[model samples]
Target: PFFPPLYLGGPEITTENCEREPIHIPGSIQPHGALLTADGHSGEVLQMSLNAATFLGQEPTVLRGQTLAALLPEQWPALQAALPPGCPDALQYRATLDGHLSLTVHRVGELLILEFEPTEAWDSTGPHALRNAMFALESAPNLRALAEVATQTVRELTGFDRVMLYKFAPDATGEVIAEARREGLHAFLGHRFPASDIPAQARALYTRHLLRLTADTRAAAVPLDPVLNPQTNAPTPLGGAVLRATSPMHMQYLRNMGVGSSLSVSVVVGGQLWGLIACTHQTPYVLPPDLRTTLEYLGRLLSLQVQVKEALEH
Candidate 1:
């Protein structure tokens, strides 16, 4: 039998509770980014976040009901081509639109959700930094050494106050196997957590999408207009969305632990979610596009190394 957190003991989580989590159709996003939902077929903007104007240079009142082409003249063509009739679950584009920006398009019902984030020019030193990290990962002789190097590498790359290699067992319970954290923060190393901390649905989604970020736990979730897709008359699934709102239970859990922001990447071994490289911060942390890509590649590298290390040990 499953149980909620012992401290709160609010209510036991059920499949219905998980189904009602509203993670996909949270209808909102962090203010640091902009979101627009439109008709999939007509491409007419039907709803937008209040912050949409920050990127489009027009108020949400003015931007809504306008065609996406009019709002993003230069990038519209590329975006259209990148998103076809049967678009991938998630597609990302980085370009100079008014300024450096990272845009993502994902299908939801018969509508499309476009998320935008202000970005900076790709760092010239990023290659050197990643190369060094790769070398360190490769030099490690065993699983423990590899995890330690990975935690340190992520800390140096992201500047997060804490990073941990959280390995999950067969039952979905997890333990922090290796950690790199700044002084003064609580150490989660060797701490064990129940599987309920991350529900089954959440873990299932991680298998398809490797990256998850919480830029600001304090930011309000910006909801969409016409919450249901007009064409489908249903809530769209956002399993692949990077900006999908965090679950309320998960949100509260983080607050109780005093975490302000977090970034986590799935580590898969033999096609299974083997563990996670979890990074937490004391304040809001917005990850850069280039840096996110770098970490994604590193996650894949670490996954491969896990297989090798396991083979050698066995």
Candidate 2:
């Protein structure tokens, strides 16, 4: 979900000694990024984590006691709008925060927190570097080229470090064959994640929904709507609709990984849960309707191209 800090500027903070870690399963992946959450009601800055900067190769000192607009090069208009006083959903942005590659701001919450979830840039010349695969696959015939093109296109579109093609199993147990990561990050290219990670229920949910900006497995969640009166069942609408709010549980999940936000692109092949493109960031973020639509289409294209390539090769 996303475990975000309850407050933005309280006191001295460290990634190691926090009330909550924002991850469901710790020990596996270390917390290496940061996230920012905004207070919807206060119109004031709330939280911005530090480790998020380290992950992206930036100085941790940059995060402490910083405001939203100050960190971002530009105003990040899209995110500002989607956040409190707006949709309050997550948004993603890429920039040279540290030395090279980095995914910043993925806004979420009541505009109270602005967490950072940073990551190191991929090695463009590494073994699993996608840039190379794009050339090889694209040179092949129709479907192969299509798959390669889609991968390249979507990677560019989302600005994610790596864009793996997750092929779900028949029983949805695990991913079959997947591409390597963007170079610097570890490669999930030929590896498989147990289906247990995303069970049937989770897959089912994706069919009808889009999962985006999942960072810090433990980021805080958008609160649920409280009914003003019990007898009438009248839910006093908080400036924004609660129906579209994020669950607290999910927020915790992102926090654990030091992830601020995540953007999951559903790639359903053959009317089933084929796989997906996981776009992530080490900062609080949100995606507007227009940007979200563009990413979704890119996911579809990636699925189509890859499937065609698989068919041709097989």
Candidate 3:
């Protein structure tokens, strides 16, 4: 739910800045109902309780007797149809609004009120904020920032600590481009990993597999079925599940940094594995199925963005 152009206003009239410390919004803890009006926009009903001044700079100062409509965008009328004139069933129409001037419409009294928020504030406010920062890179004018964003996003999305973007070398060795850390995490930001860290075979396997995750380095792999091909004589899916496949060397390498579980997502472009999005939690934490799906979507988005950037560079 986004505010239309009908509800906008300059801070001079509708909103006033307060030099005082942040004032916590009243009744914001649990999901409640409130109305929001954006710059030069009309108000609509929404489900939220945010201290306007604290989160959005300040609250509007009413001149004489006025409603929030005066501050709405000039063209707000165009979007009037989106929010119904009357209250509708809250449980039925719970649409997640996005873009600028988003609103979550719900019933509040006879009048249908709306609360306004900047798109960025809503999407980039919580844990997902870091992920938004990472994928929002339209242009990477600053490589350092890009790397840091990637690390932060991966860590938040994967619930990992000490997530690092490892830049690979021709020989397979690499240095960490950036790192995101949770409390008590050991740093690997600028450290270098030897070429032997990921040998030729390992790299190839990683590229082919697309995703590699280790829940517990100490745990063994689940064995696969004996779908052996008579021609190749190789198990179709070697040690598929319930098979013990612990990489002691790799475990030791990560253990050196105090990591118990790690996941490495390949960052490939132009038929080459450019680098990896390495995420590790202090203990075992499985990436939820939903989070994995989001990561995959994000990866595709990143690839497309990179392609666009490269095209522009030429």
Candidate 4:
């Protein structure tokens, strides 16, 4: 999620600052989850998020070289079996452990990226949420109405304080075309923002992952130990990481808006970046990864509806 009212409190963003940000390989992650990279076939752990030890309740040194198969022996069989090939966001496998953690498994090239989070802390209601959101989006009569309704549906779905559909222009800048926000908050429905505020790499990640959450804008960033994947000899591409760290400039950009956390669900149509369902909250919040996945699916449903609306209008 983005808080584009960045000009409200900080230095103006520039293209140079944008170009310097190599956000796709941040070499770090947010504190809320543990991430591990293992050789896809060999299964030996390679690189780890610094918080992995504390989060997984294991000693830091011992975790580094153990085969993930040895470390999470019980679920390893299921995880190994359910891991779908190609790392398509559509095939990410989610499972629950007897250890009371939520585990999500996927692949990125030769790496097996496993993400773990506390399952007990968050609540994600079932399929009915996506069904209702899809039904509501389909009811909108036109693109203008569709935009308005999508924001409302997302606000209802995610419970963020403010939600807006941010549309990009030919010049690459953006405008908040439609917004649904809390009754007491100031409106920013038609606000225009510079392209540099979201830059190219950021948009690339948005399209690849389709959904991202920065649960606490102010949380201390956790670094990747060794800073390079032993197997790859370079910073691991974190593009698909659910807990990818926010770029420092962009992190402060949200801070400038005085927002606590944010979420962005990409509205992709025909494989192009059409827009975003940008949501921001006033207090730190974590939406369960399962709920985030539903929001991801809902984004696809909205994308199809957008296509239908445009097809009829044309």
Candidate 5:
């Protein structure tokens, strides 16, 4: 029973409210990134976000038929060698186009989806930083220690002001078991939250994708030029896209909590979400590509440690 399931006392929420909300097919992307989809087979560009010109200096009308090859020119050769028909979800290419944006490609039904993000180059010393974080995680002797170490490590890495380890119970309710926060900031440690705070579809996305970064709650969502992909006759599926627009309802919810920017890194075990790292900042925030990716891999590490800790308790 997700948020809309019982709706006994809430303000007019019924089963159809969020359960039927199809956020994965939202016809827009966050303003920070642009999206384009091409014919999965012939690479004909079929759809693009209206922000293409604003973010990358291209018009949807001019790009509608140009192949990704024409878009990348040089980078397309190597990208074509390894793309679509069969590529892993979240497959990324470090190769930049227009010399400023990072590229990520994936297949969504019949379309080859491409996302371009303007990102800061990660520091060369990131390897040492990640190594130190992992070492701290490995030495955590118990579940409490593990959660504390992980929250602190992520807070240090992401500069997110506060990070909390939320362990979900059987009923999907979550408690903040441990937290790392900057001095003078309010703490959420030991606080509990209702299941409705994260509805069914939102949890599903968090499980399928380990991390979600909302750079700024105030940023507007960028709509697609046509609002529907001609190739598929529907809004482009943005489930695996890093820049998929955040739900308006969810954004309002964050605002109510006074959060300006946020990230959530899910910890999974046995193919289900076991916990989450709730990271937030008092103002808008963004992470370097390498640093954010490191947080994602750290979610995997936290999953392993949680599994081991739970087994020990058993």
Candidate 6:
């Protein structure tokens, strides 16, 4: 049986500006998170997102003119010490102010931006929960069994409506080799997608970023302040950022598929891009840093398993 195309043609999504695609410096955090900018020299709070109050217990407006030490007295020193001269880094820091927040520190010119992202309380299960999940993958007897277990474990962990183990062919196209999905949704098992579905640049990004997530397909992207970096006069490299916005064309493609949210973890084998553990949801979704890191670790474990099995078979 055949079916019609789900979406017709739109503006061609070229690789032009793919590296600078607003995702890197979206200057804004997702609504589910909060951001604060402080003076690198004095540690004074200079700017913050409106939702900062939700987690910090102080109105965003009130937070201004305050020093980081004044706000999070205990955690401030560690954050200051961990701050890079002119780069961005994120960590799972436990502060007295809140339970666990994904703390990202970055220096935009002279200002130090502190990003506080809330994690679900359940995420505290941490290492123990992840170990159990990885054990399941390791217990699988063969590659086929591995794929089935991988998809099911990821679906259970992320609560994505659909989870697929997509394997790429030498020609660059891919097929969903295994899948786990919530009922009433179309099955993607064995469905092949054209190579164009993931353009060359985006494919390259996957190898470095490892995980890409879109919490809400419809949310407008927040543009970086000054657009261009004051020092470099170019877009900042956000290769490691979790909140990087999606490409416009890609967002439209998801809309056409009726996908409200998505998360994709790269599966690399023997240093090459093997495939992806792609997950999709019908409604907007976001996972805390802890869970996302666990999923990323699982992806790497799966890659190692695939490599070892293939080597032994050969």
Question: Which structure is stronger by lDDT: 5 or 6?
Answer: 5
Off by over 4 Å in 4: 1-15, 84-90
What pairs collide in candidate 4? 1-263, 1-264
Point out the higher-scoring one by TM-score: 3 or 5: 5
Off by over 4 Å in 2: 1-149, 176-183, 215-218, 227-258, 287-289, 310-314
The TM-score values for the models, in the order shown, are: 0.87, 0.45, 0.51, 0.90, 0.90, 0.77
For 1-314, candidate 4 gives per-residue lDDT tens digits of: 22222222323445455644567677778998888888877788887888887678875456778897788788777766776455564367687776478888777777787888887654565558777788789899999999999999888877889999999888879999999999899999889998888787688778778888788999987877667777777667777777888877877888889788999989988898999999999888888777787788888988999989999968
Candidate with best lDDT: 4
Please provide, for model 5 over 1-314, each residue's C-alpha lDDT reduced to its tens digit, 9 standing for 90 to 100: 43221112223344457554566766778877788888877778888888888777878788888987767778666766666566666565556555467777777666777888786554523557889988999899999899989999998888888899988888988899999999998889889987777777788888877777787898998877676788655566677887887776777778888888888889999989888888888787766666777888899998998899889999
Candidate 6 lDDT tens digits, 196-293: 77766677778766888888888876543433333455444444556655767677889899999989999998777889999998899887676777
Backbone clashes, each candidate: 2, 86, 48, 2, 0, 0
**Roughly what TM-score does model 4 have, to 2 decimal places?**
0.90
Could you arrange the candidates by TM-score from highest to lowest?
4, 5, 1, 6, 3, 2
Q: After superposition, how far is residue 169 of candidate 3 from its true place, in Å?
A: 1.7
lDDT at residue 28 of model 3 (Cα atoms): 19
Q: Which runs of model 1 end up more than 4 angstroms from their true locations?
A: 1-20, 107-110, 121-125
State model 4's lDDT.
0.80
Ten-residue stretch with the least lDDT total in model 6: 1-10
lDDT of 2 by residue, 1-314 (tens): 32332332223323333333222211111233344333344333333333444443444344434455555545455455544344423334434444433433433333343323333454323343344444544565775345445555556555555555566777665552444245566655567765655545456656644444443344333322121212223322111111122334445555675566566777776666777766555565544333444666556655666667677668
Of 2 and 4, the candidate ahead on TM-score is 4
lDDT of 4 at 200: 78
Better of 2 and 3 by TM-score: 3
